[PDB]
Amino acid sequence: DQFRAIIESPEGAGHVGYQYRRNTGSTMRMVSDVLDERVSLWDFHCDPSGNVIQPGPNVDSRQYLQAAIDYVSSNGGGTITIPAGYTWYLGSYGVGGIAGHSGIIQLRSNVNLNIEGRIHLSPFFDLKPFQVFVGFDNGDPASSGNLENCHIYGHGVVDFGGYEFGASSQLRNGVAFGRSYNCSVTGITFQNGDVTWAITLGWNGYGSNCYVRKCRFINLVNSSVNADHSTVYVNCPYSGVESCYFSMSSSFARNIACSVELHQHDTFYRGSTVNGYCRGAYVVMHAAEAAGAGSYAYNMQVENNIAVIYGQFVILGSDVTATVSGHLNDVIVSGNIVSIGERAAFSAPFGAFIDIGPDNSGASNVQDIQRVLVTGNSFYAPANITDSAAITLRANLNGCTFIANNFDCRYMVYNAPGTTSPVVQNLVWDKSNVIGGTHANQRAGQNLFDMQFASVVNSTIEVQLSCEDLSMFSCILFPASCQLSYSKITVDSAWTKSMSNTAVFEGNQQAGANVYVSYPATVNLTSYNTQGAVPFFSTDTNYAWVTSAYSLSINENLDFSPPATYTNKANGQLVGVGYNEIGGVRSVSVRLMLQRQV
Amino acid sequence: DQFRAIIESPEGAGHVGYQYRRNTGSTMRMVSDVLDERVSLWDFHCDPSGNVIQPGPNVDSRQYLQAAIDYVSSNGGGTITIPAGYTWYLGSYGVGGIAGHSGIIQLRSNVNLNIEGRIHLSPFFDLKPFQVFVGFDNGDPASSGNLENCHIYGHGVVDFGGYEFGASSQLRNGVAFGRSYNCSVTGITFQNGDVTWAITLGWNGYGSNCYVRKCRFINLVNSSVNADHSTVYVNCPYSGVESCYFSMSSSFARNIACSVELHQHDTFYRGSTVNGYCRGAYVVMHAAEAAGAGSYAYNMQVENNIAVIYGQFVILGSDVTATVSGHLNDVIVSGNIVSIGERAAFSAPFGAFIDIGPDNSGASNVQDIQRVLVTGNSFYAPANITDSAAITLRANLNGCTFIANNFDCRYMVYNAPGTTSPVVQNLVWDKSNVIGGTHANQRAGQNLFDMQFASVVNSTIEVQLSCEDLSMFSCILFPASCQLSYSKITVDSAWTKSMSNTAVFEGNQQAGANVYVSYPATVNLTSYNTQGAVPFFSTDTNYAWVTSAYSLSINENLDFSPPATYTNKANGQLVGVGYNEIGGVRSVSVRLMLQRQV
Amino acid sequence: DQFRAIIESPEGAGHVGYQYRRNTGSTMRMVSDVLDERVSLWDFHCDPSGNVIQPGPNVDSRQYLQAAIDYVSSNGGGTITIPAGYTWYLGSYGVGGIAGHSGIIQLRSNVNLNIEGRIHLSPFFDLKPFQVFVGFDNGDPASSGNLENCHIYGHGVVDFGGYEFGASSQLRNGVAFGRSYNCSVTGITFQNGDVTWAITLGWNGYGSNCYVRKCRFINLVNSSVNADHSTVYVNCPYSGVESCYFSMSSSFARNIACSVELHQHDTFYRGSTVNGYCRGAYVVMHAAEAAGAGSYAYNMQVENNIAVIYGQFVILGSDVTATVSGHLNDVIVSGNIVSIGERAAFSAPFGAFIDIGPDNSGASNVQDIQRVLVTGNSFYAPANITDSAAITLRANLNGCTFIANNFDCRYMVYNAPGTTSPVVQNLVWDKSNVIGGTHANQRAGQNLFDMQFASVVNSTIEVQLSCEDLSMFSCILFPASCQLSYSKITVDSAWTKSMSNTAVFEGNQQAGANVYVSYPATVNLTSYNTQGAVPFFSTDTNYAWVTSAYSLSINENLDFSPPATYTNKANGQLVGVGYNEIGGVRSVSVRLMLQRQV
Numbered sequence A, B, C: 001d002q003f004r005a006i007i008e009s010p011e012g013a014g015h016v017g018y019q020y021r022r023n024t025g026s027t028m029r030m031v032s033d034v035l036d037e038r039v040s041l042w043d044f045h046c047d048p049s050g051n052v053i054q055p056g057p058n059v060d061s062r063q064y065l066q067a068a069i070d071y072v073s074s075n076g077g078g079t080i081t082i083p084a085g086y087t088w089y090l091g092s093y094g095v096g097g098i099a100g101h102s103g104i105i106q107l108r109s110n111v112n113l114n115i116e117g118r119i120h121l122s123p124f125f126d127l128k129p130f131q132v133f134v135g136f137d138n139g140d141p142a143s144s145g146n147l148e149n150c151h152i153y154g155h156g157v158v159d160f161g162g163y164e165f166g167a168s169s170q171l172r173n174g175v176a177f178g179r180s181y182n183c184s185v186t187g188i189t190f191q192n193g194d195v196t197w198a199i200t201l202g203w204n205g206y207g208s209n210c211y212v213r214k215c216r217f218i219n220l221v222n223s224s225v226n227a228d229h230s231t232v233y234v235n236c237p238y239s240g241v242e243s244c245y246f247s248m249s250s251s252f253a254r255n256i257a258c259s260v261e262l263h264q265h266d267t268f269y270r271g272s273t274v275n276g277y278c279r280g281a282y283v284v285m286h287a288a289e290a291a292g293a294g295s296y297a298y299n300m301q302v303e304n305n306i307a308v309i310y311g312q313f314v315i316l317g318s319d320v321t322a323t324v325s326g327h328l329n330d331v332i333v334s335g336n337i338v339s340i341g342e343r344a345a346f347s348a349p350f351g352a353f354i355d356i357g358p359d360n361s362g363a364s365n366v367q368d369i370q371r372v373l374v375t376g377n378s379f380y381a382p383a384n385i386t387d388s389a390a391i392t393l394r395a396n397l398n399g400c401t402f403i404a405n406n407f408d409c410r411y412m413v414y415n416a417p418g419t420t421s422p423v424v425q426n427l428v429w430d431k432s433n434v435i436g437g438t439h440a441n442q443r444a445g446q447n448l449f450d451m452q453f454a455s456v457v458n459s460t461i462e463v464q465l466s467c468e469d470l471s472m473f474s475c476i477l478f479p480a481s482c483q484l485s486y487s488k489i490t491v492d493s494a495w496t497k498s499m500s501n502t503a504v505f506e507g508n509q510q511a512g513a514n515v516y517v518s519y520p521a522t523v524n525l526t527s528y529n530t531q532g533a534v535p536f537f538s539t540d541t542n543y544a545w546v547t548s549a550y551s552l553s554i555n556e557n558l559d560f561s562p563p564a565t566y567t568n569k570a571n572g573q574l575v576g577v578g579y580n581e582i583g584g585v586r587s588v589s590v591r592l593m594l595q596r597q598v
């Protein structure tokens, strides 16, 4: 039987005709043509004689997957399915352009991977570096071509085999898309590793329209050797992370792991849930990464995320090289609900909703960060966590605006004394920020706003309490070493009646010509003896800066009343006109709202 | 012809060789192997002799779909397509573990359903309970195994056949995922029923990473027999509902139907549109559901939804059992635009943006709700709807914060007199909340903020009007039965000049040592006869609590001026110093801002 | 060989049996039956003898794609794949119902297109109108049937061939879904054209549940002939655009192109990124489009978008026909970060975050726009861009509310003098709006809030600066031609000490009985000679409207103090009581906060 021989051969399907639903108007095809409309790893997972090899822990699937990608790339692209119901193990490094990236598989343009099954790293990779999927085509990324139109999706899994790092200097990654344009990962679970990143998008600003959506990242740090981790690093513009889940269980992750980093303009991190990490997101312009999309990171969005972290939620920064200065501006952080998970004070990096972070060498004077809006977020830290702040302002800041947040933590504004001395401009804390009471009674010796800066200019701090905290030393304190000019500092009187210090200016900075301030204080006054309208004067001469003051106290007396309002005198006394129904020197201790130019 | 017999047999495709695109480097396969890469209901929808059965209203497809799921489960999973262009009817109950859940189909781990066609319930199910897809494997959920990695997706439809409930005690569901980990429904339309739920995720905190996305839910309540309905019930952590559409047309739905419920930590409801429902979302910690994820519901997010409802948008609650106390905290409700649809006053449950709801037995003293942020929402109710409030505060509340919302309805804060007497702590209504004017002139006999509580502590109400409503009895009223301490209550003067009552304290609660208050009032004053600086005193003695007051009125006179500011006296009179250019007793009725400790 | 002849025929696959994975419990099928579970363009892309035709620039694929759609429609629907690895060119118009829409392909209900390859317009379409995919079935949309359940998705591309418009009156579109119910486009890149729209949803309110998700729109305007462009036009309710990318590079786009328009109730535009466009979104109710969903556009959401534009971000409007009045209400604009891209002043349409736009004939008195909430957005325009405003209020407005935004541009509120004279009601600018300083020192001769209106009622403007701008003429100015009543206008004193004009009322409008105002001013005062309590009077008589004033200045003198507070007198002088320790006439120039009814 000649026909038998043909039909049973690999050419057989090319001899069996087919026409869609027996439609006389349809194309006369061969079965092979229709089968050729799809492709899977099974079509390349064979020995040199063409016999299928079953996958398993004792088989290295790398060369077969690479053969599939290379072939489909040759025919103008398509989608290769990694079949469900099997685990496909990888057990060797790739060659050529990806060798410079410890690469296993080389991605190619217009070739998508539909991962429905599981991909698992074999013990070959224990204690070694690896980047599982690499879209660079040269070991030097500067000399690499682009990866375009490459999408990885499905219900499958990338499993890093649990192996610890061999050395802190090693790098490990899941997907490095490279100089990547229109690439994405959707639906995939990345799990069980000790890695630097799960996914990186772009290279130093080269790339566009790269997205990570509906992915899970689970337990991707597990050792003390791991130097640092960010799950997704976004290093091209017009790119981002949406609707993902990030979880860690290791103690190490609570000290080293961040969920996302946004490093180029028009990038976003939205609608995701994070548990067990140190940090939520870095939002930065590194001068060293400015080649592809310029030296400005603008239009940066962190919105509608949910997080339990141990360190800082959003870290802002920018820095310089010999030839480039990085700028960060036009940032929005909104709709996020974030807490510091239960932990001892000082047992992880300092807790913060916003951190203004010094550069990688510790420099606090290279930053150009401005036009940042932080609005409609909620932040909570347990009462014991001394090291918790709405903002840790540790490096130069050229602007940040807080409106309509709920912050419930130890400090509102903080920087550690005897560390950096930031120059602060255009810091706005609107009165609409609600200050919670979880840390009430825990603030002995502490200043709610602790202004440990070199200087503050064109700034607004409108303090509004919503309950007592009579433990705090002050609502806001400026050390004598902090210059203050062209600024507005106010403390609302509600819940403050029993505080000896509301606002403290240790260098008398509130006396500046262009400082606008109001806060409560207790003042002792004595009157003249005159019957009728009579002056009251303050005993102390500490009020040369006061433009007006008014009573926050009732008058318990019948035969006289102190002034409702006061001005000052050249010698620093307050003075006002009260009323003596009967004559007599009067003496009273009253709570006043002290006002300067407001 | 022996070969003929083989080829035409069910083994035939196993004798036809194939090699992808005639690539010599590809696997030598058989056609059957490639066809085996997919699977559909057609592969199991056959009689006991293997002959295909066409689906239709007179065929029960249940056993065939179950056979497909069971088989694919056996081979490590995959995705079964329910083909487009056909309606597949279900006409009997399933057996075994799902019998305890009125189950039709049993879902199995790692077996996905790609529903491209229609699934329709046959009249067998009329007046009966049913749960169409069940992931429990035991009638007792406590004894059930887990369902993992089960995804239902496609462009198809689940049609509940229109059948009314037979009895109010019956339950009906579309998908019960069970103790569910990494399960999801995407793209599916659920329609034409009278059901309890369309989808439930998790069981009493057991489960994770379950999501409902891009689904439609249309007309799923149609009878008076239906006891209660919530379209999606989220009962496992790290789970949620995103970008869905919910519509009802029945009158019954306007009284009984809610779109989503969030019952465990780290859950979300975002970006969805609701029409025709009673309620938007319950956000609750039931102690009885605390087994799998603990007794705290935290990190609860309701954001960027669009709704026309007839009752309450978000209902908050928590409750207790003999052995567990439920807590609800760290909630954010933001970016939502919501209205009460046109209806008569009191014709549906009381309209509210936020409701603090008593437990299922009516208890108002079992709740532990705090750290809730409601910000950047818009709420509207038509002018006739008396029963509309920004918040109906009906049970104990340990904290809720309102910032930067626009509320345009009858009441801002309300609880019905002669009902519950909530203990309220840490209620914050920031001045940035804009109060609309749709209900201006409709508020005769009514208090905008009607503080019908047992007690209020550590609370802030900053009332700002944006137009007149001279019909209202008061801006805020505290009955004598409401204790008030350590709180800030302010009424801005804008649009209030003609109001006889701005703030009303029926038990003189504003006199408390730690109550901080300011509001306008009209006061009559008379002066002494003295030429020059002269005292003015109030006729009435109702101001022992006032620390300062200032004029909100012009002075129409030429020969004297009343005081700009006043303090008080021990007998409760106000006193201030004005000026008599000419001597004479003066008498004036002036509008004052009365201030206490602010 | 008879069998040979059969097997090699188009009936051959119908003679090769198959049974899934050799399962004895599975259906005995033929290979043809399984192949029939999918369908692609290859099944119809053949000559009249059934021989396949390869696609290419010299082949018109139109009739073959139409044949596929028509056939699948006949069998109750399904999904047709447009295969990857090929470009499929379109080179002629379609016939019948779509001819009235310059249609190429007619979409049919329940027939989806999985576009994995590229679709490209041939030069036939140069200088001509075209709508590539049309879901109308009649040239007159009023007589058209509905398109239902039609989804276009995949990783492919629709390429418009780069051809310029032939005439401004022509229309070009990518997908017109028609009277469209449950239709969507997901994942597709639309590029390289000169078109009116890429996608339109619905027709004059007819349609529902239509969505555009994860699409890219790149370079879709390229000529001066193009009259106007909006990328996605949403003209049915319960529909919207989510997570899309929009980019233009042409100069023309910066003057004519808008990314999205929302024209019916319950529509949304979220989570998208825009670069190179004139405008972000129109949100409008055109009376002429009111047939299918009524004359109210309500529940309109513009959230969490990222944009660099050259004109206006959100344009609001409504208008009338002979028989219908359009209303726009219940709008939310939040979470957006938007800037005007670098450009010269007046080189593109006037820059604005919100524009209240006159109708297409220029009418400013047909609008009914109200209950709009603009909250938690950030807007920036470079310092040189004179024509930049938070809101350009150019037509009648019945309400708009601004809370907790950061606006950094030339004007906050603006309308050009000598143009329209809007009637403004219920405009609310909350104090929580942060006014940036990029345009500080650029505002010579300009008013920050320039109230160029016919009238303002029931409005709130609470101006809060966050730095000096001593160049501006005033913070807020009302021309004499603007009536002002029942409104609250306040200027906070911070950073204003050196301004000669803070608030300017050119028709003395602040004197109205129901106008509530406070702002700083410098006043000269002189006292009587009396030792002791002594009156000070203003030199000028411009203060008949002032209810109280207080000092914003220190007192540099030792022997006297001026009053802390003042009232007025019938002749318009201010008067207050100070203190002369020694007798003598005193004369001082002081900075006062002037207050009226607040």
Ligand SMILES: CC(=O)N[C@@H]1[C@@H](O[C@H]2O[C@H](CO)[C@H](O[C@H]3O[C@H](CO[C@@H]4O[C@@H](C)[C@H](O)[C@@H](O)[C@H]4O)[C@@H](O)[C@H](O)[C@H]3O)[C@H](O[C@@H]3O[C@H](CO)[C@@H](O)[C@H](O)[C@H]3NC(C)=O)[C@H]2O)[C@H](O)[C@@H](CO[C@H]2O[C@H](CO)[C@@H](O)[C@H](O)[C@H]2O)O[C@H]1O
Pocket: A100, A101, A102, A141, A171, A176, A196, A197, A200, A202, A203, A204, A228, A229, A230, A233, A235, A258, A261, A282, A284, A285, A286, A288, A289, A315, A316, A317, A318, A319, A356, A357, A358, A359, A360
């Ligand atoms: C883990 C992480 O993301 N950490 C960031 C930190 O990023 C920097 O350190 C990282 C440590 O892993 C990365 O440096 C390592 O990798 C570099 C890149 O690898 C080479 O190039 C790639 C293409 C190739 O495949 C590899 O084989 C290597 O040849 C190495 O050059 C370097 O020596 C390693 O230490 C990270 O490098 C970036 O990695 C991305 C993603 O792979 C690439 O696209 C970039 O090209 C590459 N960039 C550079 C300059 O090398 C390092 O950038 C971040 O710096 C900090 C940010 O926070 C600090 O800075 C801000 C701004 O001043 C302050 O505000 C903060 O206070 C301060 O903490 O965040 C960490 O989470």
Ligand SMILES: CC(=O)N[C@@H]1[C@@H](O[C@H]2O[C@H](CO)[C@H](O[C@H]3O[C@H](CO[C@@H]4O[C@@H](C)[C@H](O)[C@@H](O)[C@H]4O)[C@@H](O)[C@H](O)[C@H]3O)[C@H](O[C@@H]3O[C@H](CO)[C@@H](O)[C@H](O)[C@H]3NC(C)=O)[C@H]2O)[C@H](O)[C@@H](CO[C@H]2O[C@H](CO)[C@@H](O)[C@H](O)[C@H]2O)O[C@H]1O
Pocket: B100, B101, B102, B141, B171, B176, B196, B197, B200, B202, B203, B204, B228, B229, B230, B233, B235, B258, B261, B282, B284, B285, B286, B288, B289, B315, B316, B317, B318, B319, B356, B357, B358, B359, B360
């Ligand atoms: C319809 C709905 O969601 N209504 C909620 C209401 O939920 C409670 O009543 C529901 C009525 O249908 C459910 O109770 C019925 O179902 C229970 C569960 O079924 C059994 O178990 C399942 C697994 C099995 O398949 C079935 O065969 C049954 O054996 C029955 O036990 C009960 O007897 C029925 O009445 C709902 O039960 C939950 O259902 C989910 C989803 O199926 C399961 O995952 C849970 O295990 C199950 N939980 C329990 C405890 O049974 C009932 O919870 C909500 O209670 C209210 C919430 O609002 C009220 O409480 C809050 C907090 O105190 C207050 O703030 C509010 O003011 C107050 O109104 O919301 C309704 O919409």
Ligand SMILES: CC(=O)N[C@@H]1[C@@H](O[C@H]2O[C@H](CO)[C@H](O[C@H]3O[C@H](CO[C@@H]4O[C@@H](C)[C@H](O)[C@@H](O)[C@H]4O)[C@@H](O)[C@H](O)[C@H]3O)[C@H](O[C@@H]3O[C@H](CO)[C@@H](O)[C@H](O)[C@H]3NC(C)=O)[C@H]2O)[C@H](O)[C@@H](CO[C@H]2O[C@H](CO)[C@@H](O)[C@H](O)[C@H]2O)O[C@H]1O
Pocket: C100, C101, C102, C141, C171, C176, C196, C197, C200, C202, C203, C204, C228, C229, C230, C233, C235, C258, C261, C282, C284, C285, C286, C288, C289, C315, C316, C317, C318, C319, C356, C357, C358, C359, C360
């Ligand atoms: C390009 C764009 O979207 N521009 C809008 C502008 O829309 C109007 O002009 C458009 C110009 O292209 C459209 O008018 C053209 O098309 C019409 C519709 O085509 C016919 O019908 C379709 C079904 C058929 O396939 C075609 O063959 C035609 O027969 C023509 O009738 C008209 O003559 C053309 O100029 C647009 O028409 C709408 O198009 C959508 C989408 O296709 C259809 O669903 C509608 O039925 C159709 N509607 C009408 C009434 O024709 C025109 O609406 C917008 O008007 C403005 C909105 O902004 C202006 O108005 C508001 C509110 O008053 C103010 O606030 C603003 O200040 C002011 O600028 O926005 C532009 O971007």
Ligand SMILES: [Ca+2]
Pocket: A100, A101, A139
């Ligand atoms: Ca390297």
Ligand SMILES: [Ca+2]
Pocket: B100, B101, B139
């Ligand atoms: Ca049961």
Ligand SMILES: [Ca+2]
Pocket: C100, C101, C139
């Ligand atoms: Ca036409």
Ligand SMILES: [Cl-]
Pocket: A484, A485, A486, A487, A512, A513, A514, A515
């Ligand atoms: Cl200064």
Ligand SMILES: [Cl-]
Pocket: B484, B485, B486, B487, B512, B513, B514, B515
């Ligand atoms: Cl008290």
Ligand SMILES: [Cl-]
Pocket: C484, C485, C486, C487, C512, C513, C514, C515
């Ligand atoms: Cl008036």
Ligand SMILES: [K+]
Pocket: A100, A101, A102, A129, A130, A131, A171
């Ligand atoms: K490497």
Ligand SMILES: [K+]
Pocket: B100, B101, B102, B129, B130, B131, B171
């Ligand atoms: K049941």
Ligand SMILES: [K+]
Pocket: C100, C101, C102, C129, C130, C131, C171
């Ligand atoms: K046309």
